[PDB]
Amino acid sequence: SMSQSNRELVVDFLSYKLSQKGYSWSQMAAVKQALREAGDEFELRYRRAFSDLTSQLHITPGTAYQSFEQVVNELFRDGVNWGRIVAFFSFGGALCVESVDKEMQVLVSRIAAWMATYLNDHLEPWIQENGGWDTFVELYG
Amino acid sequence: MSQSNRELVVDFLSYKLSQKGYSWSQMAAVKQALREAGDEFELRYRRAFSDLTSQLHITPGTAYQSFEQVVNELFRDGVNWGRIVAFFSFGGALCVESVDKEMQVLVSRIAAWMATYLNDHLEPWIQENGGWDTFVELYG
Numbered sequence: 406s407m408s409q410s411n412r413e414l415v416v417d418f419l420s421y422k423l424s425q426k427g428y429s430w431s432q433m434a435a436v437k438q439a440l441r442e443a444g445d446e447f448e449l450r451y452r453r454a455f456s457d458l459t460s461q462l463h464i465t466p467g468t469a470y471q472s473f474e475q476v477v478n479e480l481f482r483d484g485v486n487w488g489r490i491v492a493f494f495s496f497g498g499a500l501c502v503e504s505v506d507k508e509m510q511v512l513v514s515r516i517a518a519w520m521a522t523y524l525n526d527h528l529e530p531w532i533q534e535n536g537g538w539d540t541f542v543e544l545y546g
Numbered sequence: 547m548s549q550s551n552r553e554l555v556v557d558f559l560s561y562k563l564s565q566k567g568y569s570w571s572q573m574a575a576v577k578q579a580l581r582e583a584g585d586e587f588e589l590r591y592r593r594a595f596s597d598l599t600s601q602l603h604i605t606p607g608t609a610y611q612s613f614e615q616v617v618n619e620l621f622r623d624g625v626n627w628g629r630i631v632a633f634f635s636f637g638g639a640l641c642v643e644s645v646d647k648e649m650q651v652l653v654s655r656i657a658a659w660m661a662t663y664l665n666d667h668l669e670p671w672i673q674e675n676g677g678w679d680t681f682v683e684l685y686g
């Protein structure tokens with residue numbers, strides 16, 4: 406496990422250094438990087454929407470399950486687009502931070518599963534029809 | 547498709563947690579501290595970086611020898627965390643150089659020489675110096 410962990414650290418570091426020069430380790434690393442940046446950008450440009458939602462997540466005694474469903478269903482109520490997909494990831498991120506703040510980091514494993522399930526079951530048909538994650542990479546960069 | 551989506555979720559969530567001083571896992575904290583230490587080294591020792599960068603002409607033939615000559619000179623006087631960071635930075639430079647010169651094939655090779663050197667020549671020191679968790683603590 407020590408040999409495969411070292412291989413993982415090499416891959417992660419090299420992916421990073423390549424991305425700083427506008428190159429990519431792989432198709433997957435290019436997707437991870439563009440999404441990391443689009444998330445940061447969305448959070449900075451929509452600072453007001455981000456801050457209002459995070460205040461509500463902090464205040465609510467409601468379950469992370471309920472907050473997840475309320476927000477995600479409202480977000481995709483009018484359909485799927487790349488910008489809304491970025492906001493979905495940003496929301497997941499905020500929900501995980503809030504869970505850790507409340508000493509409920511166990512909820513992070515649950516949020517990650519709900520995100521992967523929502524992506525696989527409700528976002529993947531639109532994603533594939535619209536060029537896949539490679540098209541998002543091209544649109545963002 | 548299901549495992550790729552899981553990978554994207556994990557990567558994005560690891561990032562957002564790290565921005566708030568939290569971590570997805572101990573591995574994610576190691577990856578993040580090394581990413582930052584690499585940036586820091588590259589800034590602090592840009593002179594040594596830039597001087598080495600220029601003298602490097604990469605070809606599949608000369609690529610491995612260039613890696614071995616530099617790495618051997620780097621750990622000639624022993625292993626320390628700073629030299630480990632510089633090893634990663636060197637691997638990174640060798641990689642971006644290969645892509646600049648339309649030699650994308652070499653990327654995968656450099657990564658294998660780095661992993662091998664880390665596993666065979668750096669891991670005994672690391673385990674006898676507290677592991678990567680000690681690096682995380684020392685850096686932060």
Ligand SMILES: Cc1ccc(CN(C(=O)N[C@@H](CS(=O)(=O)CC2CCCCC2)C(=O)O)C(=O)c2ccc3c(c2)CCN(Cc2ccccc2-c2ccc(Cl)cc2)C3)cc1
Nearest residue numbers: 443446447454455458479480487488489491492496544545
């Ligand atoms: C990086 C980035 C992402 C999104 C945006 C804004 N943008 C946009 O510009 N759309 C384009 C067409 S596109 O999407 O094809 C372009 C692509 C190109 C490649 C990647 C970048 C986008 C346009 O309108 O011309 C939205 O569609 C957009 C998406 C979602 C929401 C907004 C705007 C406004 C705020 N709104 C609140 C909300 C509503 C309901 C439920 C929840 C939440 C919620 C609140 C807070 C948070 Cl943290 C998360 C979600 C979410 C700008 C930058």
Ligand SMILES: Cc1ccc(CN(C(=O)N[C@@H](CS(=O)(=O)CC2CCCCC2)C(=O)O)C(=O)c2ccc3c(c2)CCN(Cc2ccccc2-c2ccc(Cl)cc2)C3)cc1
Nearest residue numbers: 583586587594595598619620627628629631632635636685
């Ligand atoms: C973030 C950071 C990393 C490294 C350093 C430099 N540092 C240091 O300051 N060491 C400390 C003690 S420590 O190591 O415990 C601090 C740790 C602990 C926490 C995690 C990070 C820091 C000390 O001075 O006592 C070296 O040991 C050090 C390592 C390597 C080289 C130098 C200094 C000087 C320049 N030298 C050129 C070179 C020489 C020979 C062969 C090759 C190359 C070569 C050329 C280019 C490149 Cl890209 C890489 C390597 C590489 C500063 C900051």
